[PDB]
Design a protein around this ligand. Structure first.
Ligand code: HEC
Length: 112
């Protein structure tokens, strides 16, 4: 359900995930996360936005990718996100490549 709606919102439609984490991709993701995402997020605590360590357990990859790549579309149209906006309020322009690296880091940290 929520992945299909995330796909319709776009731009990402599908993400096939490796059985194993690509450690080198994740490391680039780590650097990007610490550049861009830590302005508002932490792994274990609430900050400006929700804690993210376990985001890949509660969400799928298309939702996560389109949150990064199309935040306005997600806020306007995705029921999960609309609720979060009500809770956290209203407040970057990554490439898909960058977003996919960050996704890989998010998958790695959930395994920690
Ligand atoms: C502050 C200016 C933010 C920056 C920079 C990033 N995010 Fe964010 N994110 C922020 C908020 C306030 C919220 C809640 C919704 C709202 O607009 O009020 C979010 C939400 C997310 C989510 C959804 C979490 C869930 O449990 O479903 C994800 C996956 C997310 N944010 C990821 C993320 C990443 C990876 C970022 C660096 C590229 C990033 N956000 C930046 C606020 C801000």
């Amino acid at each position: 359900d929520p992945e299909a709606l995330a796909a319709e919102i776009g731009p990402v439609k599908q993400v096939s995930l490796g059985e194993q984490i690509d450690a080198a991709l994740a490391q680039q993701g780590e650097q990007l996360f610490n550049t861009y995402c830590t302005a508002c997020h932490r792994l274990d605590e609430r900050f400006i936005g929700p804690a993210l360590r376990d985001v890949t357990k509660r969400r799928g990859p298309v939702y996560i990718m389109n949150t990064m790549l199309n935040p306005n579309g997600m806020i306007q149209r995705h029921p999960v996100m609309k609720q979060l906006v009500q809770e956290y309020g209203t407040m970057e322009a990554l490439s898909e490549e960058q977003a996919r690296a960050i996704l890989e880091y998010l998958r790695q940290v959930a395994e920690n």
